[PDB]
């Protein structure tokens, strides 16, 4: 995500938050992480992938 | 990679983080705020 710093640092922020939260809050953080991974993949998709 | 997919993902992302407001301990409050602000910036970037 070197060409999309905002997205990269959001991913990092969420991973860090995941390690500090619990229960249902952690599920919501993991939901956010999954959304970011989906958005990252489509922003970085090369032809042939 | 459609625009519909993109918007749905950004909406789900916003809603998930919004649920954390008032629900995390004090020491995590600012981090939730930061992530919410990043998501809104990411959304505006794509409109």
UniProtKB/Swiss-Prot annotation, chain A:
Expressed in roots, stems, leaves, flowers, siliques and guard cells. The gene is SCAB1. Dimer. Dimerization is required for actin-binding activity. Disruption phenotype: Defect in stomatal movment and hypersensitivity to drought stress. This is Stomatal closure-related actin-binding protein 1. It is found in: Cytoplasm, Cytoskeleton. The NT5 region (73-100) is required for actin-binding activity. The chain holds residues 103 to 151 of 496 of the full protein. Plant-specific actin binding protein that bundles and stabilizes microfilaments (MFs). Has no nucleation or capping activity. Regulates MF reorganization during stomatal closure. The binding to F-actin is insensitive to Ca(2+) and pH. Binds weakly to inositol phosphates. It comes from the Eukaryota. Belongs to the SCAB family.
């Amino acid at each position: 995500l070197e060409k999309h710093v905002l997205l990269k640092k959001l991913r990092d922020a969420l991973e860090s938050l995941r390690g500090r939260v619990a229960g249902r809050n952690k599920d919501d953080v993991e939901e956010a992480i999954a959304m970011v991974e989906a958005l990252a993949v489509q922003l970085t998709q090369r032809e042939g992938e």
